[PDB]
Amino acid sequence: SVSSGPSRYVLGMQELFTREFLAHSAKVHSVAWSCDGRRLASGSFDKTASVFLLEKDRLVKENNYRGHGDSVDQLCWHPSNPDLFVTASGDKTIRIWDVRTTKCIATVNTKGENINICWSPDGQTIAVGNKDDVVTFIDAKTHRSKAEEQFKFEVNEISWNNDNNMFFLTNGNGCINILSYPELKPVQSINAHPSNCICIKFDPMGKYFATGSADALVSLWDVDELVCVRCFSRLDWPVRTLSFSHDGKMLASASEDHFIDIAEVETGDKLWEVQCESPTFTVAWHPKRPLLAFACDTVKLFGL
Amino acid sequence: KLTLHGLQQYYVKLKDNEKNRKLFDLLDVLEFNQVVIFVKSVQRCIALAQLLVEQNFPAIAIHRGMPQEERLSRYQQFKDFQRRILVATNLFGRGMDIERVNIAFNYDMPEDSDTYLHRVARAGRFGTKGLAITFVSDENDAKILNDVQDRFEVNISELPDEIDISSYIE
Amino acid sequence: IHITIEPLYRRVFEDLRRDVFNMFCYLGPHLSHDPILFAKVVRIGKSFMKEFTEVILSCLLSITDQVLLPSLSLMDCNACMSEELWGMFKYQHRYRLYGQWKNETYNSHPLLVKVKAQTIDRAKYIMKRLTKENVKPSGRQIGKLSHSNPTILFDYILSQIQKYDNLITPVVDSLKYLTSLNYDVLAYCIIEALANPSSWLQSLASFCGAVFRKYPIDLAGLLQYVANQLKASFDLLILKEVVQKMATMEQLEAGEQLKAEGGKKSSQRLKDALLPLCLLMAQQGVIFQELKLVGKLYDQCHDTLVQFGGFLASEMVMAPVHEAVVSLVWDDISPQFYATFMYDLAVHTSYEREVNKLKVEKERCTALQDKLLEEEKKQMEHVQRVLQRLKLENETITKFLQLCIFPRCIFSAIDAVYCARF
16 A cells, blocks of 8 residues: 555656765765755764755755864754754864854863764753763753763663653663653663664654664664564664654665665565665655655765 | 595586576575586686676686686685685696585586596595586587496486485585 | 453453463464564563462463464564563473474464475575675574574574584574574574484584583583483583583692591491592492582593493493482583683692793782692691601402502592502
């Protein structure tokens, strides 16, 4: 049912289908895409940030921000507030930026531990993880550090449940840890994968939640019951990125084998596969959803 | 002197270009550890190595247009179980002193009974059983096959569709 | 079933339990569409066993017999749900549930035979791909096959190891990514492969030694198996290889029984008169009832293997060594010893040679000096004890001395030589 219509829309949008080849001078680390219309931004190794607008489907350039001292490690658009973003870099500082006035709102010296950054879904606080297990909670409006936690084993990716009550993280044993955010206490730990989990991501629907391990298995779980619904045995290498469609029905995963796989949530089968020259490292969607942005080992749009 | 005692030898009469699909059908049925496949030239060797690697078979090619130290280095890597399949035009004699090789395909016809003896007969220490299959394409392959049957006094019949596992595997 | 078992899952009933057991008996293996109630049955069983009535447990064995088959049918999402099955399982009844996978869980459904044929096909495919260059992309593939169908794949790879001559190290590098619950399945498949009625057995024993020294499998079932075959040969050699896996001047760098016999009814008199000398005299049935344990078992295993080799070259010693297995929570001590784990550690001209070799780093030299000083003090104490024993103390006596000396010589290591000299 949804598979045939998805394949038809895939063929139609692929016939409608850009490629910003080497927009930055160096290795692009991440891309993020929010702001329910079309506003993109990307960060790279060459301490640059780039902000794009998407009109009628050819990419144009809005902004190119400097001021960093090291490579951009993680980029993320704000979900709830009007259009703002926060950049993470290895120059011991985090930078909250303004889109409208094209300036840095706050350059906060945290530590050189700045690796991966995210928001609680209220948009009030920013969580930042590291290599040394110290996760720092900094208020986005107060611009002041609020909390410092330590998992003491391993951390790769942290995330926030949609109720702004549960806080999820991973480790090197394939476990997932679940904490209560107003309690700041470790609530539950699930020993699930044998190898470590790299990337996790929620859905806009709040129904499911996928964890991608290094055993080439994307395990899709339920949010409320916290039970393991299904998995996706389509890849042959550890999964680099995970991303969800805004209808909650499809998902995209990429790994070392150059194969961007778009599978269905409700069915559990692959709907589309596309390949390119280099391993795709990040995949992003947008709420209107005919399109798929992705950046690889260069920002490319794909009509799906 | 090399002997053929304890070996099973068979032949298949088929076309030349259909030997790849038939060989793949044999690779889908016959359980093997390491397989040496004998070809006649360099370009056929490189093309067969390309066909095996692109079909995800781990194979290494040694042809006669190579330096001696590179042949010895690839033979030493083949000793250490780095790739299963060896596409070899020729060897340095001494039988087959690696016990891991069990099934040997003559994709192309050898020169005489002596080259067939150097391709098929083994000089191992503990592994004395093995399987050898020679591809027959024309009448000349059958003539050299009957020549080998006259020289070495062995029975070489048609390759069946069911092969016992304990007859040639120790 | 979701409606009926709301409050028990909201916590984490014998008529209710029997009705739910009848519903799962009438369902069968078709829980492939619903992992949620599968996880709920797992959590209910885990809470019941944490609170832990043999009838409820036998019906739980029956529902595990009925619920392993959905995990067999799921060719997706078994890397994680096997850990819920292990949380259920955390003894010999687990091995009986694994023995249900022989012919009972199979050949009763067409789809399971289809899954069996597909996993034999993919197993043969990936066994035709394993090299030593295949440094774990293939471990991912064999793990993906082993999450869903562990028993068929383990039987197939053990047939490959038995028939194809030491393919062992790519197999263990592939099984690096194997789950927690599949380890006991692999152990039971080892036990079932040992039931086959000699180089293949040596290769299988070396494979068992490598896998057991690599992983926490808690191999008490192998200990029960080797004890049962001692009560009924080469299994003793396999157990000696497993114990070596888990843990002339060089031999001379490393007795009390003869001195006690110098100072039957004489055994009772020595028991009335008077540490490791008890096991040393035990090396010499019910009449005999009147980390050195690993070495004590290893010496008896070496004597039994020497007797087996002398028998094979051309059975009284098998009765004593089984008693050494009978005198042996030993599996919990063996796993702690494997988790904890050379010639200089044992340790006098040999002590001076060891200190000179450690001299030609200061912490090890100080430790060796402390060990040598303690050895000199204990040697002075043993010389004082020997002087006290000397202060304490025809042809038939010489014949009795020869009979006591010959049995200690042929029944032990070269340490009988030093005792004979003394």
